[PDB]
């Protein structure tokens, strides 16, 4: 059919929210992540993520979000994670429900690549850090909550590019910083 696909035609659930993050390798553009948040099934956490993308929050009545953040952990063949606007090293934690919150559920499976999941430190530790599966990691079904997914093949290529960035041997931190310059909602 000769026709531009609308934002909905790319989602699994047309009524679902869509955000994005602009990625720059060090200082140069790399691509744009287009994530579909699962508000339908995971409305509690789903909102927590969207909130940080657009900048709907305050820390001492100030603006808080995923902007100017980075991906502090890139593990090839496994996943990339970041979104620690608090410390920027993988320590900070916060949410639109305090500084942590319960695991809404584990209905969604880490069956494929490109899934957004909540990086926690034990059960019910969902904070502001998220990770994007780069390969299916079933064994996480029950430990982490899948609350989103990339929607197009361009977000998939960017994910692969990042996954390959050279990192520091044991900590897995990218040598040439991978930062989220801009982000919001589509």
Automatic annotation (TrEMBL):
Species in which this protein is naturally found: Plasmodium yoelii yoelii
Catalytic reaction list: [protein]-peptidylproline (omega=180) = [protein]-peptidylproline (omega=0)
UniProt EC number: 5.2.1.8
Protein name (record): Peptidyl-prolyl cis-trans isomerase
Organism placement in taxonomy: Eukaryota, Sar, Alveolata, Apicomplexa, Aconoidasida
UniProt keywords, alphabetically: Isomerase, Rotamase
GO molecular function: cyclosporin A binding; peptidyl-prolyl cis-trans isomerase activity
Domain PPIase cyclophilin-type: 20-185
Enzyme class per UniProt: isomerase
């Amino acid at each position: 059919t000769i026709i531009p696909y609308y934002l909905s035609n790319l989602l699994t659930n047309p009524s679902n929210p869509v955000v994005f993050m602009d990625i720059n390798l060090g200082n140069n553009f790399l691509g744009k992540f287009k994530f579909e948040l699962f508000q339908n099934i995971v409305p509690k956490t789903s909102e927590n993520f969207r909130q940080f993308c657009t900048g709907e929050y305050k820390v001492n009545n100030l603006p808080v979000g995923y902007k100017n953040t980075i991906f502090h952990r890139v593990i090839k063949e496994f996943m990339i994670q970041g979104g620690d606007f608090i410390n920027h090293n993988g320590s900070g934690s916060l949410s639109i429900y305090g500084e942590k919150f319960d695991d809404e559920n584990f209905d969604i499976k880490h069956d494929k690549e490109g899934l957004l999941s909540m990086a926690n430190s034990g059960p019910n530790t969902n904070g502001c850090q998220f990770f994007i599966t780069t390969k299916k990691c079933e064994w996480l079904d029950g430990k982490n909550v899948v609350f989103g997914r990339i929607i197009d093949n361009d977000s998939l290529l960017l994910l692969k590019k990042i996954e390959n960035v050279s990192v520091t041997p044991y900590i897995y931190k990218p040598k040439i910083p991978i930062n989220v310059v801009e982000c919001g909602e589509l």
